[PDB]
Symmetry: C3
Subunit: 216 residues, 3 copies
């Protein structure tokens, strides 16, 4: 027996719960396990879109040895804080993908990814912990994505790109491919703005916007 949850019942979680249901009901063939929202804004349990929603105290208190959680909070500092809490409390991080999520050959993705509908993860890609790939995003050949990286919808991450930990790539951003000899690097905790067209390495902690991308 198992219990599943989506951690976060705001916009991120409510748009991932259908995806978590595709993962659980169809890709895992599991019509038996219950799935709930966790949200620490809650004191008393409520329902959100027809699902039981409870705080983490209540979720921990459930008498089941086999808990699986997708963290659906886009802020990667919160996501890492919650991931470390879950693992310390013996709760499993749970990767979710949609029926229309395309995974190609020799792809490695750490536990707890949120892979939205219409996402492509292409050939020979490596992805670290609790990756968020929102609707329509792709990661193309030979990319290395670090830990707690967050893509908005419709991110175009071309080939031979290395994205370091905690980077955020905004809606519809386009990133030029690197080369095998010189991967294009997005530095740790960098922010690429919505619609930015990234043609060069982005420094760690930089915010870049526009076409072409410039420091903000």
């Amino acid at each position: 027996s198992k219990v599943f949850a989506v951690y976060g019942a705001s916009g991120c979680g409510r748009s991932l719960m259908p995806v978590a249901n595709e993962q659980l009901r169809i890709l895992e063939g599991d019509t038996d396990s219950q799935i709930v929202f966790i949200d620490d804004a809650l004191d008393d349990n409520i329902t959100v879109n027809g699902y039981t929603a409870m705080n983490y105290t209540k979720f921990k208190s459930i008498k089941n040895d086999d808990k699986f959680v997708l963290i659906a909070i886009a802020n990667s500092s919160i996501r890492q804080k919650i991931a470390d809490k879950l693992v310390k409390d013996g709760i499993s991080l749970w990767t979710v993908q949609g029926m229309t999520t395309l995974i190609m050959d020799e792809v490695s993705i750490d536990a707890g990814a949120a892979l939205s509908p219409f996402v492509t993860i292409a050939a020979n890609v490596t992805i670290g912990k609790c990756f968020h790939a929102n609707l329509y995003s792709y990661v193309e050949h030979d990319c290395i994505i670090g830990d707690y990286v967050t893509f908005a919808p419709r991110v175009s991450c071309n080939g031979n790109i290395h994205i370091h930990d905690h980077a955020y790539i905004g809606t519809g951003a386009v990133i030029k491919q690197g080369t095998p000899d010189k991967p294009l690097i997005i530095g740790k905790g960098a922010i690429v703005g919505m619609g930015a067209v990234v043609t060069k390495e982005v420094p760690a902690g930089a915010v870049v916007i526009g076409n072409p991308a410039r420091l903000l």
Copy 2:
């Protein structure tokens, strides 16, 4: 017995007829009902891509009590004019979606929407009359879309956006999310240009272009 039609046999209609066939043949499981084009440019009936095409006089003259029409004309002033005519003549507005159109939880869409392939309508979205969501467009969590709103392909409408009646959002436009406290508003009859990156409220009747979006 029923008769279906796509109103408009130009580019909008010819790229929606396959979608209307997915809706009718697969999602409604209906292999019996006939589907035709209506186009008032026609005097004599013709065929368009292997479908009978006739003007509205001829379509009205069909002896069937149960008519269903998708309006495939992108100009929203024409679309509203035709919708009001159809309803007055006792003809039903017909929502069409593709096999790859994704509708999430607690979504409300008024009759007569054209929801193209690869469209996502995410959690807790409300949409008014004869919405056009062209290929790859999405409407994310908590949005409220008014009447006769038109999206070109690949519109990125993020969460907590309110789009008023008759707005037009151009190809690949990106709209910044609002907040629960302050939805980002696109005003009545506003035009957001292709590739525009919208980061603030757009006034009613405004035309905005570029990255970032500015008045034209």
Copy 3:
């Protein structure tokens, strides 16, 4: 009996091989035929992502009368050179599409197209030799695409556009629709940069960038 191949085992080929397998195993229902990589960088045979990879000398030497090749090299000058070699050596050019590739009515596509997942080819489109439509690209109503045209991912080619031979359209580029009276032309060997917003005819051999698109 037949032998299939993907010509090019770098990023283009490795992200197309899964698509070639969807085409062969599912759309052609063929679990019998072998599929390999050809790559002329190879001296001795190797494996690439669990597929045999050999140079063209070795591929020619295979004793089979019925060879089918998808050219997965994005550089269209190389692609044409290889296509002419294959045809001269009595090897068939092979069109591949994904399970999520959408082809609409009255579409004509010459042999040897690479049609990626989530690609739409809309109504009444005509496409010439060895077309590349990378992930998420679309070609909308009434377009005419010439020979050895290459789309990066997420190209938005709207209606009534004529793209001449050997043009390259970069990641996330948007092209304004033409009219029936005046198709918007992308000239021979033109390059449209990533994220370019094309609102007018592009001259043959021009490089255009930005929003709006300008000569570089």
